[PDB]
Amino acid sequence: ASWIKEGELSLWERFCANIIKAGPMPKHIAFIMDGNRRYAKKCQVERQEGHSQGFNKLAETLRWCLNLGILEVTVYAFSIENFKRSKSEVDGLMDLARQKFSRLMEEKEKLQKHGVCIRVLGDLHLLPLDLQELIAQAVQATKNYNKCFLNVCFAYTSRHEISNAVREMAWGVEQGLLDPSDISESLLDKCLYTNRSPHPDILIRTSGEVRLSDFLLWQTSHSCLVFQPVLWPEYTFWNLFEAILQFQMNHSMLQKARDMYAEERKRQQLERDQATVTEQLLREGLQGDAQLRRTRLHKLSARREERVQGFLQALELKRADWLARLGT
Amino acid sequence: AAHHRMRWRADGRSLEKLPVHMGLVITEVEQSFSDIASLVVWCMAVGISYISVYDHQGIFKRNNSRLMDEILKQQQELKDDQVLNCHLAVKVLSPEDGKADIVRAAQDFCQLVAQKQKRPTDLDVDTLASLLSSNGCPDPDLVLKFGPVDSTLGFLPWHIRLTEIVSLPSHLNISYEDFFSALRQYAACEQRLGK
Numbered sequence: 001a002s003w004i005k006e007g008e009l010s011l012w013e014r015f016c017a018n019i020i021k022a023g024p025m026p027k028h029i030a031f032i033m034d035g036n037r038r039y040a041k042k043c044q045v046e047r048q049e050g051h052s053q054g055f056n057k058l059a060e061t062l063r064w065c066l067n068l069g070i071l072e073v074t075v076y077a078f079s080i081e082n083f084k085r086s087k088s089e090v091d092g093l094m095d096l097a098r099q100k101f102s103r104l105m106e107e108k109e110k111l112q113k114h115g116v117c118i119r120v121l122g123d124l125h126l127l128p129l130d131l132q133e134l135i136a137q138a139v140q141a142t143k144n145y146n147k148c149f150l151n152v153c154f155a156y157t158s159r160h161e162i163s164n165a166v167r168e169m170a171w172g173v174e175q176g177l178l179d180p181s182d183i184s185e186s187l188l189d190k191c192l193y194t195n196r197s198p199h200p201d202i203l204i205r206t207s208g209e210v211r212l213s214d215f216l217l218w219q220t221s222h223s224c225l226v227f228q229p230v231l232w233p234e235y236t237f238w239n240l241f242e243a244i245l246q247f248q249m250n251h252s253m254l255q256k257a258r259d260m261y262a263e264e265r266k267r268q269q270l271e272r273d274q275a276t277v278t279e280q281l282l283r284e285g286l287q288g289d290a291q292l293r294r295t296r297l298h299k300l301s302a303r304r305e306e307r308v309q310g311f312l313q314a315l316e317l318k319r320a321d322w323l324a325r326l327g328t
Numbered sequence: 329a330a331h332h333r334m335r336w337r338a339d340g341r342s343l344e345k346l347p348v349h350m351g352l353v354i355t356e357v358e359q360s361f362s363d364i365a366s367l368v369v370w371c372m373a374v375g376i377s378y379i380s381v382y383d384h385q386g387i388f389k390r391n392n393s394r395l396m397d398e399i400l401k402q403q404q405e406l407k408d409d410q411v412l413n414c415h416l417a418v419k420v421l422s423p424e425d426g427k428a429d430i431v432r433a434a435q436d437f438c439q440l441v442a443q444k445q446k447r448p449t450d451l452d453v454d455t456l457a458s459l460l461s462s463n464g465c466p467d468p469d470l471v472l473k474f475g476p477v478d479s480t481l482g483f484l485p486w487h488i489r490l491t492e493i494v495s496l497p498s499h500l501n502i503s504y505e506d507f508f509s510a511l512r513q514y515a516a517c518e519q520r521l522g523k
């Protein structure tokens with residue numbers, strides 16, 4: 001089927017949505033679409049149909065999200081861990097991906113009309129070369145759309161994403177763009193595949209499984225974890241609705257927590273900074289009553305701002321470069 | 329009565345599997361040390377090697393001694409070798425043990441990059457994992473989350489990638505049977521590891 005499944009919410013869906021939209025609504029939901037194989041078994045159907053049904057549900061689910069005014073959605077489609085499955089299965093999964101990403105071109109009309117930007121996050125170099133090219137074109141085609149964001153995590157793990165992000169800032173070091181003392185929380189954030197997106201308000205996993213399975217570990221540390229027993233291909237609007245209801249119940253507490261953590265980080269930063277300014281001034285001699293420390297603080301800050309902004313534009317470069325090269 | 333040490337070891341040996349490393353995450357911010365201490369010693373009694381204790385407000389970090397005080401007390405009922413075995417097996421954590429520590433390690437690798445000692449390319453997953461180990465401490469297999477919040481709230485994001493997360497509404501009056509129920513849950517879980 002298509003990628004965009006145009007559907008108007010029904011009466012009860014519509015009504016319950018209105019009541020819910022009165023409270024805090026998530027801006028970004030992420031999904032571990034797990035349980036396709038158990039579903040196929042349950043339905044006495046072939047494995048591949050299970051995964052195909054899984055893709056159908058993703059298309060249906062994105063429409064639900066769009067109808068609720070939730071503009072960003074991240075999904076886990078394929079883990080690096082998944083390569084260890086039988087060649088039969090992974091070839092099947094790889095073929096599915098080819099099919100869907102190829103069909104995306106024939107849907108350019110609906111993509112513009114609906115304004116859906118598609119990003120594919122992972123260690124893509126591990127995929128078959130044909131698939132990389134396919135994905136790359138898909139990404140380039142939608143890059144300028146803005147009404148709805150879908151992030152498909154393919155050949156992805158969290159650890160890989162994290163390592164990659166540190167490697168990227170070690171590359172900044174080797175390329176003399178980054179000095180060790182500039183590596184921080186923010187900078188790491190900004191070197192993840194997910195850097196264009198805010199952290200997900202909700203993370204949902206569909207099997208009865210109570211593990212994250214190496215998914216958005218950094219991004220979902222302060223987010224609402226919802227584990228629902230339903231197998232992914234059987235997901236319903238109401239499952240989603242229950243997720244949002246959990247989010248709304250947790251919202252106040254998770255906000256307090258998120259601010260506390262932010263306030264404590266700015267504190268522990270202004271602390272570790274003010275101290276660096278001390279060693280320098282004690283070793284120099286002069287030590288204040290004419291805003292001496294205050295001026296050394298503006299400096300260390302602006303040094304970072306200029307030099308991190310510099311590292312960033314060069315990282316964006318390198319990403320676009322590999323995007324253009326592999327999607328030509 | 330010492331037939332209680334034999335019982336608790338029998339309970340552990342009886343489960344299909346036990347966590348080598350258990351995490352205890354407390355989310356509750358309404359108000360309590362004896363309960364947490366009871367959990368810790370139960371863990372030790374059944375045969376769990378490591379126990380982490382975590383709260384997002386760092387209350388336990390700031391109260392390490394008062395906590396280890398109760399643990400050592402509760403532990404004897406059911407001195408220096410006993411103090412060493414709790415320090416080894418029990419870790420008290422706050423947020424700074426999570427992401428901040430990953431930044432910490434990131435920095436330690438970028439100086440080796442400045443030193444022309446290491447190339448960016450040398451940092452696979454496994455290297456980062458090593459830079460992020462203790463000694464014996466593996467990744468926690470089971471985290472018992474207590475309280476109303478559906479979040480790990482910053483608990484070891486890196487290490488928590490395959491951890492089974494079991495939720496209990498409160499730690500306030502926690503019973504052994506309630507604790508063991510969680511262990512039975514973990515023992516029955518299926519781990520596919522991507523296959």
Ligand SMILES: C=C(C)CCOP(=O)(O)OP(=O)(O)O
Nearest residue numbers: 033034035036037038077078
């Ligand atoms: C590509 C993936 C991993 C889709 C999730 O469903 P599964 O393939 O994991 O099916 P289950 O074994 O979880 O039922």
Ligand SMILES: C=C(C)CCOP(=O)(O)OP(=O)(O)O
Nearest residue numbers: 033076077078213520521522
């Ligand atoms: C793309 C998805 C949904 C991956 C989920 O992984 P699994 O279904 O393979 O994870 P485990 O249960 O084996 O840990």
Ligand SMILES: [Mg+2]
Nearest residue numbers: 034035520523
């Ligand atoms: Mg599975």
